[PDB]
Each structure stands twice: as C-alpha cells, then as structure tokens.
Design a protein around this nucleic acid. Structure first.
Lengths: 46, 33, 101
RNA sequence: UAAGGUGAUAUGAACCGUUAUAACCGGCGAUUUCCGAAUGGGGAAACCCAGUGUGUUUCGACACACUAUCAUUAACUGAAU
RNA sequence: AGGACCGAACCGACUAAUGUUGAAAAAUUAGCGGAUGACUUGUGGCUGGGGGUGAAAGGCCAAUCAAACCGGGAGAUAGCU
RNA sequence: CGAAGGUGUGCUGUGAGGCAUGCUGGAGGUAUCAGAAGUGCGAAUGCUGACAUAAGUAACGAUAAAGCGGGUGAAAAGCCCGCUCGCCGGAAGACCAAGGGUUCCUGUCCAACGUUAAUCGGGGCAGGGUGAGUCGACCCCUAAGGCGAGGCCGAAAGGCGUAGUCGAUGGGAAACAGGUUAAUAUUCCUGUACUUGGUGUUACUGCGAAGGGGGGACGGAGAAGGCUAUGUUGGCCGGGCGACGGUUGUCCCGGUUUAAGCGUGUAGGCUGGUUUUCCAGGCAAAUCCGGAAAAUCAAGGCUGAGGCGUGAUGACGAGGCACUACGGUGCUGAAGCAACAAAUGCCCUGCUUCCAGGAAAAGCCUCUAAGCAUCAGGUAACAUCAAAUCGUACCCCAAACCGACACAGGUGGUCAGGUAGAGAAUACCAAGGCGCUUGAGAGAACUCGGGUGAAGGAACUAGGCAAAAUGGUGCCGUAACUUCGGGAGAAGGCACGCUGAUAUGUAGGUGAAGCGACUUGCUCGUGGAGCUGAAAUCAGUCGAAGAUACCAGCUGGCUGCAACU
C-alpha cells in the first residue's frame, strides 16, 4: 500500500527549507523559536 | 600475531518499545440496540 | 596568470595506491591530492612549475569522506563519537614525456 | 608572571625553555573563509552567474575595489506643455 | 465511426476462502469489472480549518475528521467516579 | 581500636516503637530540650525501573527443492569449488530516474546484529574505489505558478499587482567502435570523429537593435507503403564420427560481428518557379513579410528513412599453441556471404479523416532604425588557444527507496531472444538470475490447499454459497421483442490429429541472372532461377479420446428498479 511519506528533495526544500522559512515573518518566527531552544538543526536544509 | 580488534563499533545496542492501538469490531458483540 | 603563492598552495600530496602505481607505469599518469578548490588550470600550472615536467591534461574528481567512529574519554568515562572525514580532491595528471618522483 | 611548556582525548613523536624575547595571564592591535539583515543579479542557507573600473601578464589569464532598497539633502538633465 | 465489442499491460474492488497476538494497522489466493476514454500515469504548481475540496458518502484534507494538527489561555470546569 | 546503611539474634513497652550486640560496611552520626515540615502508602485500569507467569509453549515470514563429493575450519544442512536436480524468463533478467547515502571492491574478525549455526554477510575494523569540450547538471529560453522597484489597497501585520525576475515535468551546440580494473568508463587507452567560442593572418565586403517578419510550433483516430533492429534457413569455415541398435551423411556442434563520422541522394512528403513595377498594412522603415499588376519558363526548390561506398590491407573472431600460483594470463587466428521473414522502432512533426479545433519564449534565418563611415563590424579560408565547475561508486519492482522488521504490500521510464500461439496471454526454454537464513524425522485427530469418487442429482441452504460445468477456429442455423442499430456467439449443430496425392511445395508472396529500352544508374520493361508458403479436396491410418496439455463464454424463461458508459 501507498504510505503517506513519498519523499522528494525539491518539494522538501521548497516547503520547509531555510529560504522558505525566511520568506515570511511567521516562518522567521519559527526560526527564532528554534534558535531560542538551541536546536542543532534549524531546518530541513541539508 | 593476529591482534585484538577491541572496537565493537556496534557493541552498545539501543533498545526501545512502542505499540499501536488496534481497531476491533463490536457490532454483533452488542447486547442491546 | 596564476600567482606563485596559489601554486604553492594547491598541491597537497602524492596519492599512493596500486591504482596510482598502475596508472604511473601504464599511462605516465601522476595521481595527487590537491586543494578541494583547485581548478584544472591551477593544477596544470602547479605541476609544470613545482615539478618541472610538461603536462598533457588533468582529470579531477572529488572524494566524499566516510563516517569514522571512535571513542573519547571525558572525565573517567568513555563516550562514543561519530563524524565524517573531510572531502578531498584527486587529480590524475598526465605527463607528456617527463619522469617524476 | 615565570620554571616549566607544545588545550582535553594524550600515551607517544619531534621539539621549545630555565635570570630576561618558552608557555600562561591582561590592555591595545593584525588576520578574520562561506552562509546569514546579506546588500551586484539569482537561489532549493552555506551555492550559481555577472557588470564597471584600477593594476599585472609568460597572452593562457590573474589580483583588487565598487555595483541592494528606502528616507533626506545636493548637483546635473527634463514629458505630455 | 464508437463515453462500440472480446481480451493482456494498466486502473479498479463484486463473491468466497484464508488470515484476525496477520507475511500485512485492509493483504493473499481463486474467480470478477473497465480496458480510446466522463481513461490512466510521472513531474511541478494552487486551494487551509467554520476553511478547502467533494459525479454528494458527513466522503477526503499525512494510518486522525459532524470541524485537522501543534503550541498557548490552562492546573478550563467536573453537584460525577 | 570501626559512623551511617545492610543483615541476624536477644531484651523491652499498651501501641506507633525503643535498646543492646554478632556479621557486613568503610566515614560519618548525633543525647537532651526546643523549632520547621516535600513527615509515614497496598490499593487511585496511579508513575518509573527491575523481575515473574503463561513456557522452554506458539512461531522461525510465501509449498520454487534439493542431493552428493572435495576445501577451509575448533566446529559445516546453510560459506567456497565441482557435478547433478529444481524455479523465473514481458522476469524473479538487464539499464536508469526518484529516494538512499559508501550499502561498492579487497583484507581481516564473529561479541552484538542475521528469527538457527556461521568459517558467511548489506554486521565490526582497516585499506582502496567514482577520471568527461561531446552523458547529466549548471547555463540560454520560457509554462502553470511564485516573488515583485515604483503603484493601488489595507487599524498594524499585510493583500494584489506593473516593469521585471525566477520557475521544468517542455524547446537551445557537438563521440562512436574496440580494449582495460578487484572495484570507473561514450570519462582511462587505441583508432577514427565532431561542436561552439576567442584571438591573429589573408581575401572580399554594409554593417548595426530591449524594434519588424519568418521559424521554432505542436490534437485525436485510422490506413498504407518503403525500410531497419531482429530472427530463421542455406552457403562458407573450424571441429566431430559417437559408453546402447544405427550414424562419411540430404549427419552432429560452434562461428559467420564490425559503429559514429564523411560521400552519394532514393522509397516517400510538401510546394509552381524566376524577373520587373507599384503600396491606405507589419506602433518608424525596410531591399524582409503582406498585398496588387505585368512578362516569361512550369523541366525549380525544400525535406527525407533506408541502401551503397569509405571508415576498415583495421578491430573482433570459433579454436588452437604456451605458462600457471590452475586463479587465470600471454601468442596466433579460419570463414566472416546470400535468401526469406520482420516489428509496437524509423520515413512520419508525414498522409487521410473527425471535431471537442489541438503551449510559450529563446537559440536559428532575415529586414532595417538611431549610429558608424577609407574605422568598426560582416563573410570565407587558414592558424592557434579555450571548453571551467559540480555529478559519476553501489541498490534501484528492492534485504540499500516508502511500509517501526533482511516485512508475501507500494514504486515512474527503458530493452525484449527461440518453439507453439492472434498475442507483451499461456506452456516449455535461451542469455542471465535464483532455490525465498531454522533443520531432521514421523506419516494420529483436527485445520489449511488440492485430486478422485458407487447410486442419486439441489433432496443442501436464508440463497446452487462454494464447487462442478461451458469454453477455440471455420461453416450451417438462429425466436419473441425492437428506439431498426440491436436481441445474437441467441439457442442448436458438424469438421478438426498424422501420412500420401492433386502439387517430388499448390494459390499467393518475394524475386536473381539473362535480356530490352532510356533521360544511361539508388533506371525502366520483360523474364523466371532460387527462397517462402497457407487453405482445400480425395485416399489411407492410430488411439477410449485430434481446439487432446496450459489457455478458453454456462444457457434459456418471467418480473422490480435505474435509460445507457
């Protein structure tokens, strides 16, 4: 059966990547929270 | 002469445990409706 | 033109392997480790100047590093660590007719 | 300030030093890759592609600087008219 | 010619059996329907929660849907256990 | 010279408890009287950790299957080598994209991982491995869409959008064949090519746009015809003469390969051509496009598979001859042709037809404007240089991806050999790849998946559920009803094998030499060698049975509902 995760690097980066987070102020607020928590990986960007 | 590896880069085996709730059908089970 | 300091930077080491030895003894080809950002023109100039040989052509590839695992002890306690070896660039330098080291 | 040092892992190796210019500590400097407001254009962060000058060249090319947007001010020029 | 016919790929899912701490959180085996079309499929894109989308079933919206998920108001309130 | 804590013993109080001291333990503990509380646990399907029980029980993950000999080893059902057997074969083979990220190859190890063992491994450790002007990305161009200077809106945040700028799943330049590594190859080597750009020299010259015009540039279906990939047979070459009757021949086995490029330009497709004059059009102007006249020849041009030549007296090549560590390496090397059959591939972005009327932009060709004028630029030849950077291992219908698993599931593209067959169905095979990581016995009930059953034949049951049955091709024949198409494969029948003859292989298909013409070769007409080859009829013949397996409609009658896909 087809499962929900159907990976694609281009779609991954376009949806949750660093430049996508930086494009809006809500996404920029996501990054600030993750910096405050001290996350080792800020985004899915790799 | 052979030596000793003394590494075992897989010696520490991390162990977990998790499960999932299971759907059961109860409709003829019923003593009612 | 490439300055001489750049040339003294771009060459890292000869690369030793049986593929390298066979290449040298078959095709007059020299295998080196080079700076990861060294272009083929830079490698050509560096070999031609620092080794005093005449170069036919340069072929390059990037080698991805592997994950290496070993332990470090930190205050009477051994902890397993993991990390990736750094990437490096390999040059296949074909010599016209000269003899190298 | 000094008889000890070259951070932990670290043993070792090769060395440095012993009144003073070894190491360590503080003030002031220098260097400070790439991404990131990121600002030369673009982009799927850490990558792709330039333009204009200045200088160099063994004619293959190379080095450096500048080039975002907005606000205010000034100079120049300047549509319907 | 054809939302034409029989029938593989391909797309479905009518019946039975098995399975039901499964090989599998919906499958397998034997049959079954469509198979040039209102078809099917890859790769991108757009629509966001009282909102979307729906050849309409309260269907589907990441194994969650008569109002998703995450975090917060929050130690809601609980004449009940 | 032994604190807390742990573990026994004795004593003691009405109780919560207290005291003493054996052992363990190895450094802390606290009279008394006050003071403060995270102050006392058996329960809350309480929370966390550890350990039981069922129990050495179920299970060990497709019923494709294994058996021996040798090797290594402490140990071999499982590893290696060999010989047999079995399974897939439009896949269970091969190559990728996506995704993964070293799983790749070599050496070592067997703790853990692997549903068993393990000497083995996609496991641990170490070392190695990815070579590009031509493949891909990047790059030029744009779709859907996104972002968007100014702008227009909006309590703020922000929304929309113009110029523009991004955005492939689409359009824009060029390499093939052999050889080679344990692991890469259109990347390395050998041979033979090609593209774009820069810069010089020479010769001849009108060049010059964010502008105009061409082009790129486009649907579905259907039907040829011409070919090729590929296959079969013959010829040729090399080998063979049979563990059991026969086998010097209408005998057996194997091989008969060769590319990009360059030259030629033919089956086919499209289109009249060439001059001259003129202009309310192409935001301006044009010699280009569009339009209108006139003359003169339609005998011109674009496009285009394949064949042929060359590439190539080269490469490869059955097999021999040597060495060997028996892995494998080295040397040499015959023939290398024809006929027939051929695609879903190519001509073909064609042709015919239909209506539902089938991207864009750049590269490319062309025209001029401003401008430049003996410059600069353009064209051609030659020379020379430059083509950077990143990817390249390996899996890829799967043990490397998505499913928590070495999970019977899911996953887009490409290739497609033989005999039967309409076929990419199906059966058996090739190349290639596998026997599915627990085995060994036994041969109870019962369960599962199947085979066959006397007599009966739906009596079963809610119900013919399930099973059994039917099943192909050709021909004959086929009712009511009907919207005239249907109903309809209605129903129901019959003939099917093999051998010989018609006919030493027929009808048909293909078609060589020979010959005739021509506009004189990739020509035309005639001819019929050779090859291939149904179907039918007559006669005979074997079996219980000739669509013999796999494969492959059950049929008919009356009604409800919904027209129908």
């Amino acid at each position: 059966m087809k499962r929900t995760f159907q990976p694609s690097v281009l779609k991954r980066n376009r949806s949750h990547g660093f430049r996508a987070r930086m494009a809006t102020k809500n996404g920029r607020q996501v990054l600030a929270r993750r910096r405050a928590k001290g996350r080792a990986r800020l985004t899915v960007s790799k | 002469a052979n030596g000793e590896d003394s590494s075992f880069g897989s010696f520490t085996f991390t162990v977990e445990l998790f499960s999932t709730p299971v759907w059961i059908w109860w409709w003829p089970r019923i003593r009612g409706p | 033109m490439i300055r001489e300091e750049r040339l003294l930077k771009v060459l890292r080491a000869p690369h030793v392997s049986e593929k390298a030895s066979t290449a040298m003894e078959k095709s007059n080809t020299i295998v080196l480790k080079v700076a990861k950002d060294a272009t083929k023109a830079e490698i050509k100039a560096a070999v031609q100047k620092l080794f005093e040989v005449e170069v036919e052509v340069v072929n390059t590839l990037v080698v991805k590093g592997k994950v290496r695992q070993m332990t470090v002890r930190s205050g009477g306690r051994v902890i397993r660590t993991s990390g990736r070896r750094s990437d490096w660039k390999k040059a296949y330098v074909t010599l016209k007719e000269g003899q190298n080291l």
